[PDB]
Amino acid sequence: RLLDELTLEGVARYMQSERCRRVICLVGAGISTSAGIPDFRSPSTGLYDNLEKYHLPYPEAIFEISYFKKHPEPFFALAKELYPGQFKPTICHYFMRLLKDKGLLLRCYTQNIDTLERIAGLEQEDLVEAHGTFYTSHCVSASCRHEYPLSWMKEKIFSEVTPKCEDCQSLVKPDIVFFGESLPARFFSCMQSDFLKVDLLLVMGTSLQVQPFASLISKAPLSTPRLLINKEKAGQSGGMDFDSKKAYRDVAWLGECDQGCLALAELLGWKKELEDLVRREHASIDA
């Protein structure tokens, strides 16, 4: 075992050693809840328990491509509803920023579509936006694919006018991977190389229930330590083994992502760095 204690402090000591050179982050909606964007499956606060106004066969249809092509109005209504007043990345986003600035971040695979990793300062080469982004949008006709900027999408969404392509009159969809859509080729290109060389998996804010993203946790070498920072355990059957008498490399820290990243940063000696980074960047944003 590469960790000497299955605790946050043992992970921090490992990250300070010279074996730990390449860290992969796998992040989900949980790392953005403290920024105002709700997640999907948390009780009462999650989106899946706020979708009766839209009458749906299943709650996930509002994010499924065939239902969208037949009934796009619920999705764009939810879009106008949830569009935040501000886009401020969280302590966890800036913790990943610090991993980048210190040459430790091999890649961040994200399920989020809010572009907060980008705003935190993670560049395209650092990111695998496995499920796309809300930032750009395209006509759904594969022979047209006319692109439209977020400003046009916002005018059409807030005017409550279903977006249509000025060439086909076809539907215009934000560049999100809906259920039943193929993941980008970059995902499968990065996956083949990244998980042969990874020294640490950092999983944060995800229930690990959407495929093939979740299978990423099992692509690492069997000696690679894996730290979950999440309000609840996830990824248990590869497969996260936290509790068993055979456990040897998986550590779970149950709590807020922001609190766990503060704690890990302090254990690393990066506490003041992270605090100043968050202040300076939230200031440049609030301007």
Binding site: H131, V177, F178, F179, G180, E181, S182, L183, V210, Q211
Partner: peptide, 8 residues
């Protein structure tokens, strides 16, 4: 045929 799709 296509690349693997998003699945629950």
């Amino acid at each position: 045929e296509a690349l693997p799709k998003a699945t629950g």
